[model samples]
Target: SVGIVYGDQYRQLCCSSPKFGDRYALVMDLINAYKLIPELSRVPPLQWDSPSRMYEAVTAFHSTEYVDALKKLQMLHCEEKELTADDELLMDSFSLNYDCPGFPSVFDYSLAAVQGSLAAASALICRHCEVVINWGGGWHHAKRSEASGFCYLNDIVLAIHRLVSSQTRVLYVDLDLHHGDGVEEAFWYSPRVVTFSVHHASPGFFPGTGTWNMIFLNGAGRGRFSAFNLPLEEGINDLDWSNAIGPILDSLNIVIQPSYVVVQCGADCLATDPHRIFRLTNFYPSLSGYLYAIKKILSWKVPTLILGGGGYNFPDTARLWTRVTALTIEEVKGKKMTISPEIPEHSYFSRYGPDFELDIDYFPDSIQKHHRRILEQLRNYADLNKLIYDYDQVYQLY
Candidate 1:
């Protein structure tokens, strides 16, 4: 069974946004109404860690000064009047902005985010479940002493640290619209974790780093191919996005062959998201990509942890994740990948969902030549490196 990690207290973390008002709360509400909450076993709530505990786990990647600043600001009851020049400087250093704005309960929310992922990781490490879902986790853009893109703490990094034991290799995949700069840089020097990110990389995009050539590693050729960045063009269609999945799985199976997999399935890449940088015409393509990836990963039958990240459109995010959760349930029950097209009883169906069907039809007038070439180049790179997947035998498990 898949373990679901969350806490009722963490719902307070959802703050109203000037651009998109009250996304997280609405997603949670919709998810509950669909009766999807009964699909999995709920894990225990992770109690708020003390400052020392926070420092012990967090200091491995963040600076002491930065952690101290956050702790101080969090204790200030969301008031900035008493902040000194140094405090203001530290706040700016963390990139804490509108997306990751400060509030009275910022510290609690950040701590809860960390604990939720840890609980999910614990489930995987303890063999309680083969796969665990932490919809509140996946804060990938957070740095050690800094924060960016609505993430104040790097929950993914902390969970990875907890998951790794002796000689255990972890494959980290990021599907966020923006590049996972913080997580990539955290493990860039280590060979234990191989980071692969497929994101929309524009010239002046948010973080603007993940390119095809940003595969950095240490120790010569031993880890040179550990990291890979598949940067796609803006407004990429569904089929083009789906083309990269096969190569990604093939390369991972051949090269890393990781004992565990961590997928950062950020919903901002969904077509309906207000903050989506990519141009997916409908939500089915990304959902299909997710379903494809999840099935392939589960085919490995290894201990896996799934996380949630950026998604602004609340109703659509709820609808998509609720369906994903149902898929997970199906896989756990040893059911085939036959997801019914019937929409469940939910208010978002007619309002947010266009067709009120799971699958949508899309006919493209033209495929981007450059996009095809880039994906082909990626496939060739895997082929050149002799990365092959023996799908004949692997598919037999299904």
Candidate 2:
């Protein structure tokens, strides 16, 4: 079965998600309006008995102090009370004052995302689903003590942690527009989880950390080679985007042959995203370009967990993820599905304008270059590192 996490509660929490207002709601709306997943294929929204359930997943990943401050802020907001001086100071120290704001429902919003991701993981573990999509999850920038980017908690990390077992090696394929820094950092010292991220990495970019050189991780441990970054230029087209992915996937499959794959499918790289950095599209060669990447990852026949992140353009994020949901259903359920090019009518139907079509537009011009050079360089660099690691293992020279 292909499982999708959604319902009224998820919608309510997601619609208020601090950095990504309405993007999740729009995707859920489009999916429902278009009937992307049949009811049988839907993963039920998590059952919540106590607030502690959410805390169990989150507090395990983040610091207790940070989580406690988050809770206190939420209580004060709900009570319409002003923050105490220490509370304001703690908020500033933890980056709650701006960007990652401490809104009325901040803690509740974080918990709901955790619940959805945890539910997604369980569905995969129980063999009840081959594929699960948690658009509410994938907050990849949250640190153990502070939040970075728009992410309040690293739901991606929590979900990946749940999926990892002695017999189940996990491969993280982060197609998010930004680096999956949080998740990669979480497993930086481990060999069990390898991260492959393709993101726009230029100087002065926010959270600039994904580097092509493995030497930056020289003494970090076995994980130096485990994490692979394909830093690309902005304004990348669909084919260019896909080209960088192929060699990396082939290389990782040979190296790890992972038992489980966690894919972060962020939509901000699409042409219309508000991030205004990438020019990629949702369509090329009749394949949803995003789905094309999924097809590559799933070609390994590994059960996968897919999460959402960093799509600012509301309508197109909905458009792209809806297509992804449709494709997942077809692949996992063995059902023949046809997605109409014209959008189905819904409350946000008017938002998809001009052509009012399902297809995500591509940039009429190409501004991205040096992709071929970067792809070859990364391939050669990875192979060089592979040889050194293999030789060390074979000879015990380390």
Candidate 3:
């Protein structure tokens, strides 16, 4: 049967982003610290156990030119440099070319991406693996020949490739603010992986290319929904932001009954975060809730995989993701649990700032409304057998 798989390397990512690190701590406090990860929460470590495949894949994807370029830049930037955040971001954001130092083979950090992809793809093959939610991986932008977006090998693409060879129909869905440019480009001419990304489109976004709707190009003769992009308007709030999802699903219904669904639920989309202009505080929970709804809608078992996408707001991201993590657990196991208690000194409030308490209460306000709406909408849609597939129509139910 399909299930959520995780790994310890993911928790290590908690501090990878400065802002996100703070938010992660806040979430840990709210969700009762590390205690929230029960036995069921454990996602095993990468058995690659060594840097073998990861190193090769990283080098294989990026050209020696790009790899070398990245290294040269990394060295120049980190040269005992007292740097500002901008300086760090520039260095961090740069893609490794042949000129840069190749990606380091750090223990847990480097391998987890590939391991997560392997796990996710493998999970999809289980006899009842119709819908698998893998929380640890969604490193979409890792370029074919270079590491970008902190992603080494474009794990999502690798995992999808595993399926493509078998003639499996793959639908890659990314809700992250940035476009899934890497994955989209990988399968640009190929018809196997249908890439759909709803993210920031206009100028200045990372790897930007989600604007031109290339539903079908390069001989991808409607084998399935071809490379597509749904550029969303800014200030998208929860109430109606999810409106596009149903339509997209309906579109999938017509294009192809995908055997698997990969959802990149990025935490950056949370509305509470100041960086993202999109109002997705409610959007995420709706998404988490939609996981349940999707199971019900398909009725019959179908493979579904859910993964954490991008979210920036610490408090909001953690709060929302904890719920998503919980939802994944609920899908497989009947029991449910909530945030336990915060560690004594680690309590940090992202939006609430030091006042937030660790408890199940967070789930009610930030996520429940959206969850309820999704559930209600699914029920109504299922009952009527004639529901309008539009966000506005769904808005009425929410």
Candidate 4:
């Protein structure tokens, strides 16, 4: 059995931030799902309103002391109307073991994401699903004791811990525009779990730490691909991404062959999101990535787990997430999409304010070149038989 889980907590939390569009987009995706969407909509992720309940759900996988510290930090924000650079720095320092009071609902929203992950994992466990898809689950930067880049909850770490507690081998895959630093650090020196990441390299963008060599292979039977970090340059296409990911998948199927595959399917790489640096507009990269990963899972028949990592664009997230939902059902069905954008719903597009005017039609022109270039890159990589080729991988359990 395999399933998909998503939630409205994203809307609840983002309402308090400038990223409200992100939440609204998620809503539209749910209500006005694309034509050919899946029927897996029955089991949505856990959605909680109160911080107390959200707090409880998160603590199920996190530490009590960390939870208490997060509460105190949240309280500190209300006492002060404004936060300074020094305040952010001070908060970052304090965030070493707990959350820093950053935005309005960073803590709440992140914890809500964690709850979604746990809920999805629980469903998977009970159903004995080989793969689980929790679209709201990949807040990868939150460390054991700190928070950064709006990632206060660290659902990946918590969920992996929860799964590991059950004594299952976990493979944490990160494909965020940014690296999976928090999860990387959480298991930096261990072989019990493996952390593989592919993201943009930089002069320390935001948290800025996913360099070429974060591969710390320790306590291993051999120097297997324990910690693989592939920081890509800007302008990565499906071809480049596919090239990068091909061997990882092949090796995954052959070498590591993890019992469980946990993926962070961040749609941030799509150029629609206002925050990302990479320029992309098509859904092919996302679709191709997930398809490759899911194909491998279907072949191996492993119980894979998935989470949404970092796609900030509202409409794209909604539409693309619907596509992903469709992909999960690809095993039972064929590569056919039944989505009908014809479904009428409340025009969530109105919430974008003035920014809603930007027509999404331009996406085709914007992405075609990149897609072709990348496809060429994938062919070249395959021809060369490179050790590491780049493609995207976000999958589900069977």
Global local distance difference test of model 4: 0.58
Ranking by lDDT: 2, 1, 4, 3
Candidate 2 lDDT over residue span 1-398, tens digit each: 78888878778988875567788878888888887656436676566568676566677789888898888878878886778898889888888777887888998788778788888988988989888999888888888888888888788888888888424678898888898899888888776787878888888887788754423441146555566676777877777677667655655665566788999998888878877787777773445557788877777788899899888888888888887887777777778668788988888888898778888755441212333433343344446445322322222210
Worst 10 residues of 1 by lDDT: 212-221
State which candidate, 1 or 2, has the greater TM-score.
Answer: 2
Off by over 4 Å in 4: 6-32, 35-38, 41-65, 76-92, 96-106, 128-130, 213-225, 279-287, 290-299, 332-335, 341-345, 349-398
lDDT of each: 0.67, 0.76, 0.53, 0.58
Candidate 3 lDDT over 192-292, as tens digits, reads 56677767666676665766433312223332236666666676655454555555445544344556666676766655555656655432324433333
Model 3 worst lDDT run, 10 consecutive residues? 98-107
TM-score comparison, 1 vs 3, better candidate: 1
lDDT digits (tens) for residues 18-125 of candidate 1: 333455555555556656566677876455358687677667667777667667767764665776777666677776655666666666667677878878888888
Candidate 2 regions off by >4 Å? Answer: 47-53, 212-215, 284-288, 363-398
Q: List the residue pairs that clash in candidate 1.
A: 62-144
| lDDT winner, 1 or 4 | 1
TM for every model, in the order presented, reads: 0.81, 0.88, 0.67, 0.72
Indicate which candidate wins on lDDT.
2
